[PDB]
Structure formats: C-alpha cells, structure tokens
Amino acid sequence: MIGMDRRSGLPLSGLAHLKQSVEDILTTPLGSRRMRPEYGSKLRRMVDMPVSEGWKSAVQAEVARSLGRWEPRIGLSAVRVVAVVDGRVDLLLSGVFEG
C-alpha cells in the first residue's frame, strides 16, 4: 500500500508508511478524529502517570488494542521500558510484521 508522508508530502510506500501508520494510532487520542470516534489510543490518558509495573502492563494491553483495530499488518511482540530520565520514559515498541 502506497500512502503519503505526514510532513513534506512525499509518497512513501513500503515500511516508512508502516511506521507512520503506527504513530498515527499511538498519538491520536480517542474521539479526536472527525466521524471516527473509535480511533486512536488511550496513551494520552497514560501521559503523566507514575511508571509502576502495572503501568507497563496497561500500556502493553492498550497498544495491543489500538493497533489491533486499525493496524492488522503488525503483530505486536512487546513494549519495554528501556530508560528513565526526568519524566521522559521511553518504550521500545517491538513487533513482528504480517500481511
């Protein structure tokens, strides 16, 4: 499938379109889209919550829901905390490719 890039307008198809397809899921909140209320992630609700070991398993369980809806060509493997600086947690979104 051939789509266009979000910035700079260039049509990119293979796997750069795959990565921006995921980051339109993860950063859109629910109900922000027009006439598509069941689109996006609850990750903005997980913004600025304390990083516990139940916060990690609630992000894995919510990325898997939101990518399971509107990204069928990605099989999610794991989400892991790899570093912590002040506020900035960072997550290695790893997943196999299907489709």
Partner: protein
C-alpha cells in the same frame, strides 16, 4: 500538641541544673530509692555485725538486678564506701554505700536523615 487534647509534650523539668533536666532522671532517682527503702525497712536499728555491711550490699544488688530485668536502669554498680566506713562511724550508727547507676534517656529527638535518590531507577525497566 494534637487534636482536642490528644498528647502531652514535655520531657524537661524547670531546672537550672543541666544534669536534672529531664523528668525521667528526677523520677528515677526518686522512685528507685523507695523501691529500695521499702524492702529495706530492715538494715536500720538492727545492730552491726561483722558481715552486716556485706549482707545488705548483696541485697542492694539483688533489688537492682530485677530493675535491670524490668528495664528500669542500664548497668549499675553497688559497693560499700571503703574510706568513709570506719570504726569511729560505727559507734554513731553511720554506714555508707555507693549506689552509682545510670538510667535510660528519653528519646526526645529522633532525627531521620532522608533524601530522594535515583539509585534504584534501573529496577524500573
């Protein structure tokens, strides 16, 4: 201090002497002696034998080891006064002992030295 008359807050007596500041040291010195002077209604107007001094200074120790047992004092020493006890003092009924002990200080100031580190942040991975 706390709500509706919940606590009392004073450890220290009105004392210009720094030794007798706390209420506990003033009470312990006044309430280990009636715990001894009762239990020693004897050893007064009895009659001084040869081992009279020894048989009561082993009875002062026995009535002080139970005070260490119930946590009233920390380690003590009870011994007869060697230089004040003399033959001229026996003729007027005067005999002397040394009941030097110590007491538990009340923890009026528990200090907690505390910071927020970032040491166990690698536990969150």
């Amino acid at each position: 201090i706390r709500d509706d008359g919940y606590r009392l807050w004073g450890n220290r007596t009105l004392s210009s002497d720094s030794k007798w500041a706390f209420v506990t040291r003033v009470r312990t010195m006044d309430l280990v002696m009636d715990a001894i002077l009762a239990g020693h209604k004897w050893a007064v107007d009895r009659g001084i034998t040869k081992t009279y001094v020894k048989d009561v200074t082993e009875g002062l120790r026995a009535f002080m080891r139970d005070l260490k047992n119930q946590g009233a004092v920390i380690n003590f020493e009870v011994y007869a006064d060697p230089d004040l006890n003399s033959a001229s003092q026996l003729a007027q009924g005067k005999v002397y002992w040394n009941i030097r002990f110590t007491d538990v200080p009340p923890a009026e100031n528990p200090n907690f030295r505390v910071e927020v580190t970032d040491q166990w942040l690698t536990e969150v991975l």
